[PDB]
Design an enzyme around this catalytic site. Sequence first.
Site, mmCIF file in Angstrom:
data_model
loop_
_atom_site.group_PDB
_atom_site.id
_atom_site.type_symbol
_atom_site.label_atom_id
_atom_site.label_comp_id
_atom_site.label_asym_id
_atom_site.label_seq_id
_atom_site.Cartn_x
_atom_site.Cartn_y
_atom_site.Cartn_z
ATOM 1 N N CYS A 10 7.134 -11.312 -18.716
ATOM 2 C CA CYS A 10 6.338 -10.103 -18.515
ATOM 3 C C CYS A 10 6.120 -9.902 -17.013
ATOM 4 O O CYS A 10 7.062 -9.503 -16.325
ATOM 5 C CB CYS A 10 5.037 -10.167 -19.317
ATOM 6 S SG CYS A 10 4.364 -8.502 -19.473
ATOM 7 N N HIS A 47 8.564 -7.177 -17.505
ATOM 8 C CA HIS A 47 7.970 -5.967 -18.095
ATOM 9 C C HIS A 47 8.510 -4.740 -17.358
ATOM 10 O O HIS A 47 8.716 -4.789 -16.150
ATOM 11 C CB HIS A 47 6.436 -5.971 -18.024
ATOM 12 C CG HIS A 47 5.799 -4.944 -18.930
ATOM 13 N ND1 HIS A 47 5.630 -3.628 -18.579
ATOM 14 C CD2 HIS A 47 5.338 -5.049 -20.205
ATOM 15 C CE1 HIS A 47 5.116 -2.955 -19.598
ATOM 16 N NE2 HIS A 47 4.891 -3.797 -20.597
#
Lengths: 188, 188
Positions: B105, B125
């Site tokens: 992420c 992400h």
Amino acid sequence: ASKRALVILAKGAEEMETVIPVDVMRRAGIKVTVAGLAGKDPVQCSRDVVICPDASLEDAKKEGPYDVVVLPGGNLGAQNLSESAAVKEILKEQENRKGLIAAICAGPTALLAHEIGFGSKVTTHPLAKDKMMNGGHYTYSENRVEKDGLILTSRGPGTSFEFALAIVEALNGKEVAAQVKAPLVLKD
Amino acid sequence: ASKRALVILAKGAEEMETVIPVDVMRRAGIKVTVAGLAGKDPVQCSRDVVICPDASLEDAKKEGPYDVVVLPGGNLGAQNLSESAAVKEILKEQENRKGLIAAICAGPTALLAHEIGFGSKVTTHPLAKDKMMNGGHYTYSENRVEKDGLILTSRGPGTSFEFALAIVEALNGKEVAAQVKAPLVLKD
């Protein structure tokens, strides 16, 4: 105007099945209280992750009512939930006021112990099926998330995101659920 | 003959991205140490879940080496990771001995801060892409899990299970991963 969720956390709970709904529900703007069954002390989950609850269950009981009561799974966690008279009282009250009850994986088996929701369609982990169905008091579903009236159930750690988003959709509606889902980078 | 994993936990980490790999890796028989960046004290994650680490990072540093070093995401968590000289030292040593480095992420952005893995294909992400790509030091992938040499990256909370199983497959092989996956009730 803020919806409130109670998550009941006992020794031996499946930590993924605890953190994922808590996190997702807070992304949706729900006020979540993670309440420790045994007190305010830190709780050793099933895979030894240790989580500090927000409150004891005794204290959190007094700051109700809650729009949803959430029962995580984990075999030893569900057994602790199933044996607790405080849980029985919380669930019976939630049933009477027609609030939502959500349980995942082995969690649903506490509903049986406490005579909650008889006649409802429910699902469990496959390994918990025989236990939930003892006596034929519920109808079994193999859907990943199942909702029948005020009883929302789901099957295992890998269904935890779908379970959590279903709680969000029930409390806050489909658009909030869709808005919270997008940044998570879920497949479906 | 037990593989060892270090998970580095800082204030502001994404709690789902922390608990899911820890839990899955322990199901696979890996010895996981959840090490707190600031000490043994409890850590407030991004959605206010509070987790007690197994050890301080200073202590855990001394019980190496680790087969995998795991960097969770969460924007404030990754920034704390990116600013820590202890993390830089841990990652540089892991790179030199050709151990696995896994980040999810926003986590991968600490690799950039610490000049780790330049030239590798990585993912992040979507919201962290511009930051990771500053300077063109990596090649960007939109695969949900990406692995290039010893750098394993993944995109967000909803990819956390795939990320964790990929770590398991790298350390213990495809059959252990398949065996651990089945009871989780994942879709794919």
